[model samples]
Target chain A: ASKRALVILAKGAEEMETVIPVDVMRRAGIKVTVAGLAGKDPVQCSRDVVICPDASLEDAKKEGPYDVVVLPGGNLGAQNLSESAAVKEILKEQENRKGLIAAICAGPTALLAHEIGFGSKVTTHPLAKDKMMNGGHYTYSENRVEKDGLILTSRGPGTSFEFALAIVEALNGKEVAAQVKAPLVLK
Target chain B: ASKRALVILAKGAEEMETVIPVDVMRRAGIKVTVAGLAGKDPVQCSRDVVICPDASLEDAKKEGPYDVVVLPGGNLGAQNLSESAAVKEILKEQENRKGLIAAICAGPTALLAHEIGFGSKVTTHPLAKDKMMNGGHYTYSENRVEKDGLILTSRGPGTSFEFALAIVEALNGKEVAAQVKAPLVLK
Candidate 1:
């Protein structure tokens, strides 16, 4: 079966976090759908990118067998998304399927906020990790992409290549991701 | 009659320039169809944002009677967009109708590239006016948005509110735009 990635669009969704994965995944030929927040018709991201969704949060709750869930960090946006019952429920569903969960920048907070994997290894926006790491037993890896129990998290904006490539490698194969990574000259 | 607005999504389009207008216009309830040279898919904007289009360029050109045409300034991206014969022709069409033409930051260069206006009061991204002046009458105005004929231009990121509000005000009477602008304190 093909991989389907659902991206949640909301305020403060990091611009790069949203773009890189989609570009890389689509390049690798994975199907990606943007799911807007609960009842948000035209969700306006923190940076003011108004995005219309292919589905709503309500639809995302019931969707099955999603291979991956990607969260693009936007401070308040990610926090509110994590707080959403639907998003939290999705996290729970992914937990059972051992699905991949990825967060970039402030997005890692969403995982914690939802209590998805507090003890798992993760990374996030450089500045906001203090609260996340405050006595939490999770490993803080400098590596941009950390895959632990089907979860992936990256450091920041500059790490998009690493973040995106990891997804391509995960869904399609290392070869497809490698083809795009080679041209980027990313270490 | 309903008004129309264009959202240009191309690689490296300035973040503020694109988001601000889309924010301001939609707040006014105007219909905006984002178009790009990327054919059928969403394109990664240089600003770390992934922008999806409401329609394709070919489709927008045939949609007919667009009330306003907008260009976001990313020197390189704008260059590619302006060079397209189809883009230039649609611009020329918009101009012929005296329809509102707005360019923000470096995007105004595309206007000159397409030879749409010369010897017109044009404002653009900082220092862009110097280059723009070489082609036509250009004024360096500090106002977020400057009005000279059907051509409207604004300063830089700091001017997103003023620029977007100006577009909102232009399309929807000032009364309605003011109501939209009021909440944001954009006035």
Candidate 2:
């Protein structure tokens, strides 16, 4: 059976963060669903690029048990994800199952918002540290990409490929991740 | 006056390549237009991500005399770009004016197809080198990003930020480019 990954997209999401993982995972032959946070409309990304989601969050969650749930970051996008009770439920379910939950840049703040992981080492955009550190829950690291167990986090757009390849390594293993990384011409 | 960029989008374009440069350039405060090669409808990117263009290429060219023109690469996307008479004319005019013209990954093959920037230093996805060297019209470099006069080229997905930041530096100056790069948390 193939691994399935779900990517939640919201208005104001960083398009590079959103698109990079989706493209790389597909290259690794993962079944990826880009779900719109709002609805099935075209998502207006942080940089004003418009991307049409593969499905809506409401509808996509029904097909859950996804191997991993990906959260991409932009300040407002993370805020929106944090505020969604639906997102909290999904994260809780994934956490309860011990499945992987990946977030990048401001995306980790959503994990903080939902209390999905506590006492795990994580990373986020430097500017997002204060928010993710509030209440002193999760320990922070400045590693370009940090993974403490099933929870994965990374810095920003510069680290998206590293973040995503980690997910591929986790889900598909190192061989597949390295295979995908080569064609990307990554240094 | 604000600088403007025209990015021509085609079906099978690499979504990561397309979105990264577009987002990064917008971060530099450049007005960007994502023009569709087919028409004003959504484009199905190489990885199956669908993106809606700001306008049809036919419409976008009318507003041109843009500061820069960007071409993103995916094998099929480059093939589409290479086959376009519209793309040929756009490259020709930009060359005549000595305006900056940028292409990334397989995107530079379009320049070869259009017979633009011959004798300039260029680079492309390693897989694309042979096609680009078909007639040995241009010199090839293995640098992550290459710029010879107004013609700029870059490698693949991983090099998109550098490719875009270079475009930003060309249009807005090194200081503005640095300022924009800072917020991206790029290394």
Candidate 3:
């Protein structure tokens, strides 16, 4: 079966972080859905790049049971994700199912906010470290991409490609990830 | 004066390529306009990431004479850019002004299509080499980011950060570029 990945797109989201993961997953043949955190309207990212989501989170959640739930990072965007009760519900359910939940940069902070995957070794953008470790809930690692069981996390925009390829590897396998990474011209 | 950039967004543009540069440029404090090729409609990118352009190329071009013009790459997106007289006029005007005109991956092929910067040193995604080298008109280099005078080119998605930072450096100098690069956590 084709793996399905859900990416929550919120206003002030880091456009590069969001787009790179979505694009790479699609390239790896994953059915990735970019759901708007607000409504179905276009999202204006942190840098003002506007992206139109495939559906609203309200609408997308009905399609449920995703292989992975991806959270992209920008301070404000992560804050929005952290404040959403709906996001909390989704994260809790995904956790109960033991499905993969991936995040990058300030994104991992949302996992902290929702209290998901506590104690899993994780990573975040340098600036986000304090917030993510606030309660000392999760042990932190400085790896560009860190995976401790079901929770996968990565650093900032510079590591987006690697972060995304790690998601590809998790869902599709090593061969698919390598094949997808080849044409990207990554260093 | 704040430097402005015009990124012409066409349907089928690589979302990663387009968004990375736009996001990075904005981080560097460059004023960037993402203009749709056809009109002000939402553009469905190569991998199906939909982007809403800030304006139509018609309207944005009227306000241009930008400090830099960016051309992102996807085979079909470059084809659309290649086929448009509007794009040709924009490139010609930018070139006439001796302004920076940067292209990446299949993007440089559009420059060739328009005869905008013949005899300049350039590079493109390896798969795009045949089309870009057809006329033997330009010298090619394998550098991740290549800048020969006003023409800047780069390889693929992997090189997008380098390409964007180079544009920032050209317009804003090393200090500003370094300041912007810091938060991105680029490898």
Candidate 4:
């Protein structure tokens, strides 16, 4: 349906960034469809890791669209997403449709490539923020979460909670995010 | 069994450090005894996240001794272990018994504290190596599947394969370790 979140995973995505969010969201009853750029098999992360991917970008584009679009932050994850024509196209479509476009750590660089960061508020992993920020509002806070437009951002590992909560709220409601966060003391 | 590994997980230990080795070792058919200093319950991480331990140090030690002694690392993981009297006693046992002892990332500090560092090359998370070093034959190497007497060590996350392999080798010998590493390319 139109309620499913698309988690875009590709070669080189931070394994932790990709898996932890998926685990947190699933625990919150979110339908996370892992999409790989390669329309072949479940892709690997970083080196030669071979993990399963739920769908392919070609499949998502052909099967209409998705709700929240997620990208993992890592050097290779960002680089691959920004360079993929299919990913850029889907992102462009989602932005126009006012759907959530969330990325974290190095993943924000991909959004910057789509000009999503130009004149927009943003945050990223401390190391990659300056390079990723395209004249956007850079909050040096270690809060780990930020929301700007449909584009949600985080500062990496510590921010996983804030990022997951932001998406849970956006999809279900504030109450749901609170319900999920209560147990983790993030509420 | 005579070849069990004792993974000492203290408060603020990295979740991945405990989870990954246990996960991989279980897959390789190794018996792992997770020892929590306090109780056989959930312990918090340095990042404020919570994880459950398998057994309490009091109970596990009561069951008798172990062959392979392990301490996983995180920001506060090593520091926390250094403070645990239970952990110190077991580490001293490993040293006296010449048992296979292993540590990675900040966990290597557990070795440093026991004065296992001197002349015995080991690696740790680079950022904390300066602060954590305790007179070991510390070699700043990339991927070291090092074997110094009964003490084994590796750098950081990237060296999980080496770390895991070292464990497998110690418990089940090199042939079985090779078999486990083959499919995963962990060798």
Window of ten residues with lowest summed lDDT in model 1 chain B: B178-187
Per-residue lDDT tens digits for candidate 4, residues B49-145, read: 3445667889888875777877877768888887776777888877787788888778887766656545666667766678655343465544455
Off by over 4 Å in 2: none
User: What is candidate 3's lDDT per residue for B30-80, written digit by digit as tens?
Assistant: 999999999999999999999999999999999988999999999899999
Off by over 4 Å in 1: A182-187, B1-7, B10-187
Query: For candidate 2, what is the TM-score?
Result: 0.99
TM-score between candidate 1 and the true structure = 0.56
- Candidate 3 Cα outliers beyond 4 Å, as residue runs: none
DockQ of each: 0.08, 0.87, 0.95, 0.04
lDDT tens per residue, model 2, B94-155: 99998999999999999999999999999999999999999999999999999999999999
Q: What tens digits encode model 4's per-residue C-alpha lDDT throughout A1-187? A: 3367788888877655665566557657777777777864656555322445666777766755667889987678789998888888888888888889888888888887776544556777877867775455343344467786677888764465567778888888888777766533221
TM-score of chain A of 3: 0.99
Sort by DockQ, best first. Answer: 3, 2, 1, 4
Off by over 4 Å in 4: A47-49, A134-143, A182-187, B1-187
Pairs that collide in candidate 1 are: A12-A46, A12-A74, A15-B48, A16-B48, A105-A125, B12-B46, B73-B107, B105-B125, B119-B137
Question: What is the C-alpha local distance difference test score of each model?
Answer: 0.72, 0.95, 0.95, 0.69
Report fnat in order of the candidates.
0.09, 0.91, 0.99, 0.00
The order of the candidates by lDDT, greatest first, is 3, 2, 1, 4
RMSD over all Cα atoms, model 4: 13.9
Quote model 4's TM-score: 0.52
lDDT per residue as tens, model 1, B1-187: 6788877677777654676577568668777777876675766555344566667888877776777888877666777777788888888988998899888888888888888776567677666767776734455565657888888887664465667778888788889877865533221
DockQ metric, candidate 4: 0.04
Across all models, the iRMS values in order are 11.2, 0.9, 0.6, 12.8
